[PDB]
């Protein structure tokens, strides 16, 4: 949880925007900005940002369509070229799309990513 | 901190090898010793620079006499027979303490005054601390 | 795995390169039998009077070209969509768009076929070759053998960010056990377009010494 | 010193319950203790084991004080990694380890661990 | 330079060249050697000079014929040593008869006639009697 | 001799010409059937008004070109690596490296095949021709027939030292029994780009005489 | 053991660097510098020279791999283009790689070389 990765990715506001009485707004630092920069993109849908009209993952335009191998291969293609446009700091390395064992309707996507320029593991969980 | 030049050589020369396993190890490891102490004088004198240029001087001691190798190192083990003799000729730096009186003449020159001329009734040990507290 | 059903070829025409405006789709009746992708690169060999070293320089990487054939039919009892409807839909993708005064950008895709790490084949139609055979006596065609030839025109905001993940502007490096600074600054030249010098690597990290790093420490190498 | 050998003789006996079993096992970091436990082992099932000498200093906290770790957890992954591509017939040595900074003991201190005539310990 | 640990350790020992085994041309060198250490067989096969010098001694007239045979392109050869003493710097007439009486002996005729691989013989020790023989 | 097992084709991509940085490997599923190496040299024939001698000068030696085809498959029960994984790995070798802004340097090698006195074929990919056939109905391809075409780009520090062992700057010569100095200085012209003159050969060795050499002596012929 | 071959290859320090009280450091002369220049290259591995990062025969990166005809043909290829880069004075003429008859694990390489520009045999062993 060091100061070095802040110099590669910068400090920004945390996506749960919780404000504190000391230190002001909680700042998402370097390795944790790039994870939260992916959490903002998957959580907004395109068109509801104000002036940046096409920003956000459109997974809404293909749901309520049946789970087959052709829908799964359309998610991995869509989720790959969208992180390329709106996330320059995180390179994707694998996408795993599969339907859950418990409930058959829901399917769970898992994005594995590395940060660009750096191969430094996170020590433990936090911020 | 000083890291030895005998570390950065390739390991087939045997400087980080076990000591005196082959006979060619010891004449090589004494050849790197004079060119190590010339570089170890250069690493001391940058670390002496807060001491060398302080206005509250208190010491005879100038450029440096510290041994280059740490006491656990294998490079110390080669010259362990004559490390007491080499450290004592390294204590020739007290003979170079006239140079310290030429810096006090330089440091007093910031405030417009030269140092005092050397007299015949000095008692040169007790003369110098008067010249030190003057600065 | 999950199901068993035909994925079919779809060509989506976009008015712009980025893929934001849609101009219409066309799903194929029967899929192509084969898909041929042709790449090409131009190399010019340097001539010199003095030396005789064989060393060819790099000039240009020509874009990819996909070549597929389709068939459309209305003879059979299973299919009833007329071929005038589908050939009008296909020629409107190989067509000069009146909004942008260029042709439209096609995106061929079907199934889990990655076209060398893209889910689609973004490019425009370079040729098109309709071969009508077997008309009815009403002169409605009942068999049509189109041969498409595309050339790759990919978006630029996608290709801007592949260069940044391949050769970034800033690198962080983890040291490991007695690699020197002269050795570690050579490892930066793998991905920094000429590595940082071993002095200018030590100045940027604020090194107190040339060997003043612990093996756990992270160095930073910007250019 | 014999407490290590009482643990190795328990482990090599444990690999006799059924056909396909192997045992990757830790060697003591002290060099005198390693040479004694190599000589005074005296089990009749010695070929089912392999000992990897230094403890790895991985990059997990408590980069400044990385946690000192057994080496055999990394070798079982590269035994599995060389089984995937080059089969079981390929030797699992000379392959890089991922998350380690340094062996906590020096390499030159353990040059007496390899013996071409006696019991040799992997370094 | 650690020679017992696994790695790349260079040695001074010369290993043999890949022999072509020409079957119809292979010589014997029947001459005096200084060592004569071989106790198993009668006539032995050599391949290189560095194999010969370890196997038949050094600094004699028959070595420089082997050393010149391996320079002109020969690759295999046999050596049948004479069991008597190595002669002087010059050959005396009392000693030069001891060579030719050893060439008529059945001790060297049985080693040649029993091996059935050799196709030509030669003595490089006959030019040793070119000085002061009479 | 020692063992009996298939050696397989590997293409190692390097970012630089010398072969120091590695960009990734690709081992072939099945080896190529045939390997075709094509050399070529350009000769221009000199025209002259006066004479009619047929004498063609040397212009340039074009680099070598290796042409191999591969097949990739996923139909069979023995093989399970998908062809999207392998064709993504193969196109990343015929690709513009973002570090050096050129293509990458490939080194094809397999077994004891010397490619005319090199263990590898150093060169870059000039063309590449994927021919997808036999898709699944999931549209995953199950057969792919790539045709590679390389052109030879060899390292320069290797070719600098082949010229020095072929035509060295300094020669030492052993005399043999009554060859004259006029005859021995002609034998230097075999490997000294125009032999040293019989005077300037005698001056360099410090000869007291033009015939003042013993047959055992070693002469030296520098240029 | 003449002065002529010194003029083609120069004098350098002997690789066992043994210093003497007369004549200083023992100098490797012309025909014997080029043999010892091969003994330095095979004995160092790449990366442990200080600033010349890629200097030395990397036979370490393929050992503990099984002896077959594909490893042997990779040694003769590696040992050939490495003497071309780091030994301009010695041209290789044959490589023989075979495993020893005594111990089956070890395999012994034999490099045959001529010096460039000169065809002069060495008379006997020495220096």
Automatic annotation (TrEMBL), chains A, G:
This is Phage baseplate assembly protein. The lineage of its organism: Bacteria, Pseudomonadati, Pseudomonadota, Gammaproteobacteria, Enterobacterales. InterPro entries: IraD/Gp25-like (IPR007048). Residues 29-118 form the IraD/Gp25-like domain. It comes from Photorhabdus asymbiotica subsp. asymbiotica (strain ATCC 43949 / 3105-77). It comes from the Bacteria.
From TrEMBL, chain B:
It comes from the Bacteria. This is Uncharacterized protein. The lineage of its organism: Bacteria, Pseudomonadati, Pseudomonadota, Gammaproteobacteria, Enterobacterales. The chain holds residues 409 to 543 of 950 of the full protein.
From TrEMBL, chains C, F:
InterPro entries: CIS_tube_prot_N. It comes from the Bacteria. Residues 6-155 form the Contractile injection system tube protein N-terminal domain. This is Contractile injection system tube protein N-terminal domain-containing protein. It comes from Photorhabdus asymbiotica subsp. asymbiotica (strain ATCC 43949 / 3105-77).
From TrEMBL, chain E:
Belongs to the myoviridae tail sheath protein family. The chain holds residues 15 to 148 of 424 of the full protein. This is Tail sheath protein C-terminal domain-containing protein.
């Amino acid at each position: 949880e060091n100061q070095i990765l802040t110099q590669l990715y910068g400090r920004g506001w945390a996506f749960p925007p919780v404000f504190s009485l000391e230190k002001g707004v909680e700042m998402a630092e370097g390795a944790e900005d790039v994870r939260q920069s992916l959490q903002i993109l998957f959580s907004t849908e395109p068109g509801e940002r104000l002036m940046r009209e096409n920003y956000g993952c459109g997974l809404n335009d293909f749901m309520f369509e049946n789970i087959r191998n052709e829908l799964i291969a359309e998610i991995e293609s869509h989720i790959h070229d969208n992180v390329l446009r709106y996330e320059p700091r995180a390179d994707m390395t694998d996408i795993q799309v599969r339907q859950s064992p418990g409930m058959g309707n829901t399917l769970q996507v898992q994005v594995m990513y590395r940060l660009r320029g750096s191969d430094i593991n996170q020590q433990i969980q936090g911020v | 901190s000083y890291y030895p030049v005998s570390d950065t050589l390739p390991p087939c020369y045997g400087l980080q090898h076990s000591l005196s396993e082959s006979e060619h190890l010891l004449p090589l490891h004494q050849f790197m010793l004079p060119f190590e102490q010339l570089l170890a004088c250069g690493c001391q004198q940058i670390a002496m620079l807060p001491r060398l240029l302080a206005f509250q001087r208190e010491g005879y001691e100038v450029w440096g006499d510290q041994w280059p190798f740490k006491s656990g190192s294998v490079n110390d083990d080669a010259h362990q027979d004559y490390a007491p003799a080499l450290k004592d000729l390294l204590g020739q730096i007290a003979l170079d303490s006239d140079h310290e009186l030429d810096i006090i003449n330089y440091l007093l020159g910031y405030f417009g005054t030269q140092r005092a001329p050397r007299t015949f009734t000095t008692q040169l040990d007790d003369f110098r601390a008067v010249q030190q507290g003057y600065l | 795995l999950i199901e068993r059903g035909l994925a079919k070829l779809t060509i989506n025409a976009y008015k712009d390169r980025e893929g934001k405006i849609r101009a219409g789709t066309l799903q194929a009746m029967y899929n192509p039998d084969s898909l041929q992708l042709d790449y090409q690169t131009d190399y010019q060999q340097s001539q010199a009077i003095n030396s005789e070293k064989q060393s060819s320089i790099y000039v240009q990487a020509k874009p990819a070209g996909l070549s597929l054939e389709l068939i459309f039919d209305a003879t059979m009892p299973g299919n009833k969509t007329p071929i005038e409807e589908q050939l009008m839909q296909l020629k409107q993708l190989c067509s000069v768009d009146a909004t942008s005064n260029e042709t439209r950008f096609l995106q061929v895709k079907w199934g889990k076929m990655r076209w060398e790490s893209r889910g689609y084949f973004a490019g425009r139609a370079k040729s098109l070759s309709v071969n009508y055979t077997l008309f009815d006596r009403d002169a409605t065609p009942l068999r049509v053998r189109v041969i498409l030839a595309l050339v790759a025109d990919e978006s630029l905001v996608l290709q801007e960010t592949e260069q940044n993940l391949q050769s970034p502007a800033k690198i962080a490096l983890r040291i490991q056990d007695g690699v020197s600074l002269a050795l570690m600054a050579a490892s930066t030249a793998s991905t920094l377009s000429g590595g940082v010098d071993y002095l200018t690597l030590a100045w940027q990290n604020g090194l107190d010494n040339l060997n003043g790093f612990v093996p756990g420490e992270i160095l930073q190498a910007t250019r | 010193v014999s407490l290590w050998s009482q643990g190795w003789e328990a482990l090599l006996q444990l690999s006799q319950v059924r056909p396909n079993l192997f045992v990757l096992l830790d060697a003591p970091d002290n060099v005198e203790q390693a040479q004694k436990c190599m000589t005074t082992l005296s089990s009749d099932y010695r070929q089912w084991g392999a000992a990897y000498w230094p403890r790895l200093e991985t990059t997990y906290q408590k980069i400044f004080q990385g946690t000192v770790l057994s080496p055999t957890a990394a070798v079982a992954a590269v035994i599995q990694r060389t089984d995937n591509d080059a089969g079981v017939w390929k030797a699992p040595a000379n392959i890089a380890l991922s998350q380690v900074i340094r062996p906590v003991k020096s390499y030159l201190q353990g040059s007496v661990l390899f013996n071409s005539s006696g019991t040799s310990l992997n370094v | 330079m650690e020679r017992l640990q696994p790695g790349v350790t260079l040695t001074e020992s010369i290993i043999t060249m890949g022999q072509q085994e020409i079957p119809s041309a292979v010589p014997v060198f029947i001459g005096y050697t200084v060592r004569y250490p071989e106790q198993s067989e009668a006539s032995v096969r050599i391949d290189s000079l560095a194999e010969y010098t370890s196997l038949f001694g050094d600094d004699h007239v028959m070595m420089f014929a082997v050393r010149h045979y391996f320079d002109n392109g020969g690759q295999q050869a046999f050596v049948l040593p004479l069991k008597d003493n190595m002669p002087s710097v010059e050959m005396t007439t009392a000693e030069a008869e001891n060579l030719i009486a050893a060439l008529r002996s059945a001790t060297v005729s049985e080693a040649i006639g029993g091996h059935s691989q050799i196709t030509l013989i030669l003595v490089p020790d006959m030019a040793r009697l070119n000085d002061s023989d009479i």
